Structure formats: structure tokens, C-alpha cells
Amino acid sequence: SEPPQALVVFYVALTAVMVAVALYA
Amino acid sequence: VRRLLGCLGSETRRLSLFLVLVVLSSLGEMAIPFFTGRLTDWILQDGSADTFTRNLTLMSILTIASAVLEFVGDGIYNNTMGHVHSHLQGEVFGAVLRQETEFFQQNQTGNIMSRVTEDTSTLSDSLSENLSLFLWYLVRGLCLLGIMLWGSVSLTMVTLITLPLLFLLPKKVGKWYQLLEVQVRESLAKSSQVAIEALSAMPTVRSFANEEGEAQKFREKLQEIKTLNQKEAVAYAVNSWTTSISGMLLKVGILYIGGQLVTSGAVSSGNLVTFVLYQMQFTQAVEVLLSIYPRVQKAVGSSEKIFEYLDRTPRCPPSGLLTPLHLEGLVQFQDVSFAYPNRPDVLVLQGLTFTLRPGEVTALVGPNGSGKSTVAALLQNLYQPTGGQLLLDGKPLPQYEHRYLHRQVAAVGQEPQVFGRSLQENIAYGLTQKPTMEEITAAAVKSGAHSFISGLPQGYDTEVDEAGSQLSGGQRQAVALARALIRKPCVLILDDATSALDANSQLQVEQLLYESPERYSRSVLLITQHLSLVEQADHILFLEGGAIREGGTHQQLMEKKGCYWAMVQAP
Amino acid sequence: MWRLLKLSRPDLPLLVAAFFFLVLAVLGETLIPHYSGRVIDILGGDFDPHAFASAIFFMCLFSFGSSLSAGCRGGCFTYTMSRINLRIREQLFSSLLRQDLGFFQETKTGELNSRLSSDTTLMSNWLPLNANVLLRSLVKVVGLYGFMLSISPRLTLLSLLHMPFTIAAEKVYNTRHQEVLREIQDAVARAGQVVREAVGGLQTVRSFGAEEHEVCRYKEALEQCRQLYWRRDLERALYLLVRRVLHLGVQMLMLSCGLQQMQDGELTQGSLLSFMIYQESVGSYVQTLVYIYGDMLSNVGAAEKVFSYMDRQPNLPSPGTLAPTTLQGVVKFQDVSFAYPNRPDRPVLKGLTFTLRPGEVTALVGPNGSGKSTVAALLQNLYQPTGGQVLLDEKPISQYEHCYLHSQVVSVGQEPVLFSGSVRNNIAYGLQSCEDDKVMAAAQAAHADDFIQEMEHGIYTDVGEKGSQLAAGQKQRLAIARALVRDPRVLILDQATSALDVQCEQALQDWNSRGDRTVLVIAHRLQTVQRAHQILVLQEGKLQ
């Protein structure tokens, strides 16, 4: 896998935060 | 959505020619990159200089041909769209100018101007932006469908079956876009009306120090637009989310189905890979087509008012066909009663019955608000009576041709309007054939406007502003009288035409009424508050409360004590 | 432009949010393809169900995140554009209201409305589409140039050739594009003025039967606009064609250079082949970047009329601070001469000198064009005399505060202009607060209350646009009431009884019943000028 694992979990956290904010709005 | 496509019917041949080039360009863009790669690989591979030169020129020729095709298609499309825009705007303005008189009381000037000049341009821009993209991506998707069918048949069928499920939400949402855009257009029109009304009549605003009030009105109009724009932005974001989710769902479902069949051995991996490689691009094209739809709904919403104008049936009789060679100004009122359309319960005129004859002057007098200007408007065929008949030379007014009737009947108006043109054009306004400079000078001499016009540096070529602010009141009234006289009408209407004229300029009107040798060729309806101008009239009608109370000559009305006698004996 | 940025400064947080979302979307889009390729490889032989699901899951995750970020970015950009448009509209309209009266003779109302409605959208629409493409292309170029370091000498060869070739023609193209855009806007304004005039004066046009003439005029204006549009489109198409030709030439040159290098052993066939794809993408991205930059510059520069209007200084004296708690009402003309600014070297008034005193009525008479309305305008500080002074209580009229001055000196115009709205809004026009009893008393003083009761809604009945739904005498009575509401110290009556009947005219002859105000009467009927204490005769702009 070319992308490092830390960046993958960072994007996972970003997507989770976006979904949480969208549900909170 | 069918009403939008109606405006494109005139340019069908050009659109078909554009579509053929679109198909050719799509096929080229499909095939040229593959040919370029093969030629480049062969050129890079072992070969003589002749092989390298032969392969090099082929790619250049293909690219140049593609560029030329794109250029030609773009030119044709842009020319057609420009013609469509011009035709649509012209048709909308022409339809607007055909409505009845009370239509312009219900709709204000700035509102109509915003509808005519701004809504049509927005509709044309949306149409020209979206039609080419729709055609381009529909052709590309149809091209990709063949390769998808080649790669695998059943997977293509399940993709096609799933496809209609992605269009359920936009179909149920587009009405919201329609209503939102309608509200946005209405708010913009209201702001435009406020701006136009404030910018005209600036001296009145300045003399009362009310600039801040006009600014506050404008800001109040802008607040609603801001409120609607917030919702527009939120809807844009939501739609963009939904389109991408819909695309991802297809891209994942097809992969899941392919994974299952590859395991059971019912399909070959070599076919599956080449199927999905183009399924990717087909989903992209479907996403673009999905994103087009809300813009179409918005465009449908933005054109409601102008299409209502185009489809509206005017509430007035159409033009007639009679243009008699010789006409005399015999006008007969027969029990005429009238009420304004916006307030039909109140009768302004009741049972009028009088006759105008050539060579005679009839005066109409009364208190303010009695309805004299209403009689003048009825005589000019601006409105139709609610009861009774109004005949010119024995026939109803709507039976004559529109331009012929207004050549035969002319009026001045209580507070005359002039347009932002030269003095020569103002006097000769509305005439089918231009009069010579001798006739215009004769009319200006008759009206008394020649004295001040000749003193101007440019004379009859002097430009006046859109409201005639560079002229004084008396000069403007004299110009209006000259405009009325140039037509040689058989019926002349003078609605308080001496209100702004000085003592010297009233002698011109007196000589015109009672001394000119042209009296015998016309009948005059004289409306005035200046009672000394009335003494020589053949008949005097006293109008009070919409009914004629007294009638007769000056001597007869003075002998019988009454309303006219009381009005004359003011002290 | 520097000014547009300082104008859009209040929208900085939203722009920052949009930029952040765009960065996140680009980050997700740059990694989706790797997992797409992993899926394509897994499906292509040596199938493994476990690694298939992981790749599909990662693709789903990255696509979801990128889509959400892109949607947020688009929403933010749209809202920013709308806010900028509304702010520009408000500022332009506020600036127009401060100009001198001579400004509105030069211009036309329809053209000003066109500037408000069309030029502002052109100004505002530079944000959404250009910024995203700019940032995406910049990121792609920066990333792609780094990958290409596999053959360094060719890159220097490249940056020296492909980049500066396009600079020469774009200088000409941008100038031509800006000129054509400016001409298009001028033509659009001219076309709008035709509709303005035709709709505004509909009844006169119908009375002369000249609707088809107006339609023909509008169609001619539309034809001019269409020709300008076609010219712009054709020039853009030619520019794009020339760009494609230049790109093809540059591509052929490096193909030749790269093939020459490969035969010399500088690089393998695999390195050369991978170099060309990057070459093809980089050229297009650079061309798109430069095109978008030029388009932004031209679109910004095409709207200089709005900027010029928004900063023009009116030809008026500095605002005055005077606001005495008490005012006598003595008006003095001291050798006043005036010529209209739009047509100087044509004097209207020549050395007038007179005095108006409280408790007295002065009559000003003369022929048409003598200059009586000009005197009334000068008294109200609507114009400045070219020579001499106009004094109110021994101080210049221009030194008084604007609202106070027009609260104390009130006039009735020759042909009164009303506004769309209720009767009680036209009465008490320009007053922040006014009780109903004052409105009723003023209407009674003007003899307007009798016809107001006959209307269906009383004083709340809607007066039409320009007062078109009233008789002339009723409109004049409403104007008189509007003047009388503010009980001014100085009252000017410019032909205020022209449209009234004799019975109402003789009832209003007592303009100074209280005897505490200064009244100036301009009239042609010498019956009303008989009771004046002082009579001034004006002939050719001179007293006699």
C-alpha cells in the first residue's frame, strides 16, 4: 500500500467528523 | 419541460448539423488516443527514419482535424444560440406591448423591465450552457454503452435496470427549485422597481431630504434575496452530495456482483476487467446527466413570468380593418357609462349623450375629479365603455385600423410627456412617413413653439432628456401642441392645454380655435379650467359627478342661474 | 483587482472554509485511483476474496470523504458569490443617491438600472468557478513537475520552451476580450433604455399608435448586441484553436528530443514512455491556469463603470452644520447670476437682487422660460449660483444642515411628482415620524379630505405609480398637503393652483393666515397675484 497507515486513519477520522457534524446540523 | 424546448424549433437544421459534428468529435476522441499510443509505440520501437516520419505526421494530422472539427462545431452552436436569444427577447417585448391598458397599472415599470431584460437573458444563458453539455455527455454515454455490452451483457442489463432508481429523488425535489427561483425573480423585480422609481424624480427626493429612506427601501428589498440565497446554497450542497453518493452506489454494486460471478466461474476475468474499466466512465457520464437535471428545473422556474406574458390573452378588442379615404369628425356618445377595471363598483361616468360636429367647438367643464379626462381617454379608445355606444362617423371605434384611427384622432394630454429625442423627432412622433421640414415648421408656428426653438443653438435637432427636464412647462406644452397639430386630425382633443401657457401663448390657442381657416375640417373637444376660453364655444357641457347637469351656449347658461353661473360668478 | 479584495474582505471566514474543504477534497481524490487500480489488478487474475473487500472498502471511504468535502466547498463558494453581489448592489445604489442634479441629466435611468442589474453579476461571478480550477490546476502542476525529475536535463529544456511560448498572444487576446466585454455592456444598457422609455410612457405611445415603432427600435438594439456577442465567441474559438496548435507543436518537439536522448543511452524506453503522459498533462494544466488567470483579469477589468460611479465625487459644496433652534425666515438675493452646468455660456439669471420678509407675500411673474423655476430651485439649494450669494438669515444657504434646511424651506413643484404607496405615505413624505392627527389636519388645510373619504381605504388607499390613479387636481392637493405638513418657515408655491378649479383656488388664496411665514408665489393668473405685498417682474432673466 503506497499511502501510509497513519494518513489512512487520519482520513477515517476526517470522514467520521464530517458525518457527525452533518448529523448534528 | 416541453415549453422550454419550443423556442429551439426554428434552428433545427443548425442543431442537427451541430449534432453530426458532435458525434464525429466523440468518435474521434474515442479512437484518436488509441491510435496515437500505437503510433508512438511503433515510432519508439525499432524502425527506419521513414517509419518515424510517417507515424509522426499521422498523429499531427489527427489532432489538427480534431481541433478543426471542434472549432466549427463551437462556431455553429454559438451563432445559433445568439440568434435564439435575440428572437426570444424581441418576442417577449412584443408580447408585452400588446396587453390592455390596465395591465400596466397592475404591473409597474421596473417590474416589467426586469422581466423583459433580465429573466430572458438568464433563461438563454442557462439553455446555452446546458444543452451542449447534455448532448455531449449523452453521446459519450451511448458510445460507452456499446463497449460495456461487448465486455459483458448481463452486467450491462443489471446496470440499466438499476439506473432508473437514481432519478427518484431529483424528480421529487425539482418543484422546490422551481418555487425558490420564482421567488428570487420576484424579489429582484421588486428591487428593480424601487431603484427605477427612486432614480427618476431625483429633485423631489432631494428637496425633501429623503435619500436615506430610498436606501432603506432598497436594503429591505435586498434582505429577501439574501434569505433566498441561503437556501439556494444549502440545496446546492445537498444535491452535490446526493449525486456522488448515487454514482458510488452503482460503482460498488457492479463490483460486488462481478465478484460473485467470478467466484462461481460463470464469467472470465479478462471480460470482467474490460467491462468495469468502461463501467467507470459510464457512471461518470450518468453523474453529469444527473447534475444537469436540477439546473433544468431551476430554468423552468425562472421563466414562469415571461411565458405567462407570452401566453396571456389581452382583455381588449383587436385592431379593425377600415381606412376610409375621406372621414369627417362626427362623434356620437349614446348613453355611455364607465367604471375603471380595478374598481368596477364605482361608476365614474353615467349616461353621457352628446355629439361633436365638424366646424364646431364643444367645451367640457366641471369641478376636479368629475371625469373629463376619463371622457378624453374613452374617446382615444384607451378603454371600452361598460354601457352604451361610442361611434366615429357612424361606426364603433374598434372597427378602424389602429394607426389610421390615431392619425384621425389626436390629443394633447393634461400633463404632456415628451421622449428623449430631438425636437424634430418629438413633433413628428408616430408618423408612418416622415414629414418635410416645411410641415414641422408650420406646425411649430401654429402652436407658438417656433419662437423658442429657433433660438436654440441646434434648433430642431436639439436633443432633450428622457423627461424633457431641459424645457420649461410652457415650452413642453407648446411642443406637445405642435405634435398634435402635425397630423391634421379630424377630431382634436385639448385636455387643459393652456394650464402652463402665458398670456401671449394663449392667443395662439384662441386663434386656432375660433379664427383659423382650418376650423371647418375638424371637431374640437375642449377641456379647461380657464372659463374665459369657453365663452365662444358652440356648446358647453357642465359635468359634475359623472353626469351632465347643464348644456347650452354661454348666453343661455348665464341667463339660467345654475352650476355654470355660480362657477363663473366666483367672487 | 485590489479594490475587489478589500470589498470582499467581510467574507474572509467563508473563503477560508471553502479553501480548507477544497484541500480535503483534493487529498481524497489523489488517493482514490490507487485503490481503484488495486481492485482492477485483483479482478484481473489470481482472485482473492479477502483483499477484494478491503480495497472496495477503502475506495468507498475515500470517495465518501471527497464527495462531502466537495459539496461543502461548492456551497461556501455559492454563498460568498451571492453575498458579494448584494453588497456591490447596495453600495452602488447608495453612492448614486449622493450625486448632483446635473449628473442625472447626463445619464439615463434605464442605463443606470442596467448597470445595477447586469454589471454587478459580472463582477460577482468571478469567485466560484475560477478559484477551484485555479487551485486544482496549481496543485496538479506542482505535483506533476516533481514526478518528472527522472530526467532532469529535459525538464530545464521544457520549462524554457513550453512555458514562455504562450505569453505573447495572450497579451493581445486579453485586450481584445476586455474591449469587447465593455462594448457588450454598453450595448446592453442602450437596449434597456428603449424598454424603459416605451413602458414608462405607454399611454402616450398608444394614443399615437406607435407600438410597432418601439418594437423595431428594440429589435435594432438587440441586433447590435447579437453582433457583439458573436464577435466575442468567434475570437474565443480562434484563441482556443491557436492554443491547441501550439500545444501539439511543443509535444512534437519533446517527442523528438526524448527519442534523441533514448538512442544515446540517457534513459530506457520505459522511462521515456512514462515521461510523455506527464508531458501531455502538464502542458494542458499550464494552459488552463494561464487561461483562467487571463479570464479573471479581463472580467474584473470589464466593469470599470461601476467602480467609477462608486467613487465619483459630486459637484456640491461641503456639507453644512448649521441648525439654529429658532429661525426668522429672511431671504436675500445678492447679485445672483446662474447658468445650468450641462449648458454653460448660456446665462439664465443675470444679477437678481431682492429680499423676502416674514409676514409678507411676494409674487414673481414673467413669460415662459423667464427663469422663475430656476429661482425656486436656487432658493432650495438644489443648484449653486455662478455669481453672487443666496442668504438665509444673513448666512449662506449652503451652510445649513441638509435635513434641517429642507425641513424649514419647503416647496410645491410645478408638476408635482408622487410615489407609489398609500396617501398617508405621500403626505408626510420624508418624515421619520408623523401622527395621524397632523396628517388629517394637513389634508383638511389643503381641501383634500373630501375626496379622500370617497376612496375605498381612506388615507391608506394606494396611490398609483407617479400618482397615475388620481385626478390632476387631487394630486396637486396632495402635494400641497405634503408641503403643509412640516409647517415650514419659508414656503414656495410654483404654479401650485394650475390644475385646481376656481372654487378651490379662491379658497386657498390665504397662504399667510398666521402671518409668521415667508411665502413666494409664482403664477400666471394675475388674479392670485393681486393680493401680494410685493410684486417682482422677471423678463429675460432680469428684474425690472
Ligand SMILES: Nc1ncnc2c1ncn2[C@@H]1O[C@H](COP(=O)(O)OP(=O)(O)OP(=O)(O)O)[C@@H](O)[C@H]1O
Ligand atoms: N387609473 C385610475 N384608476 C381608478 N380610478 C381612477 C383612475 N384615474 C382616475 N380615476 C378616478 O376617476 C375619477 C375621475 O378622474 P378624472 O381624471 O377623469 O377627472 P377630471 O375631471 O379630469 O379631473 P381634474 O379637473 O382634476 O383634471 C376620479 O375619482 C379619479 O380618482
Ligand SMILES: Nc1ncnc2c1ncn2[C@@H]1O[C@H](COP(=O)(O)OP(=O)(O)OP(=O)(O)O)[C@@H](O)[C@H]1O
Ligand atoms: N435642466 C435644465 N437644463 C438646461 N436648461 C434648462 C433646464 N431647465 C430649464 N432650462 C432652461 O432655462 C430657462 C428657464 O426655464 P425655467 O424652467 O426656469 O422657466 P419658467 O420661468 O419657470 O417658465 P414656465 O412659465 O414655462 O414654467 C429656459 O430657457 C429653459 O429652457
Ligand SMILES: [Mg+2]
Ligand atoms: Mg383631468
Ligand SMILES: [Mg+2]
Ligand atoms: Mg416653471
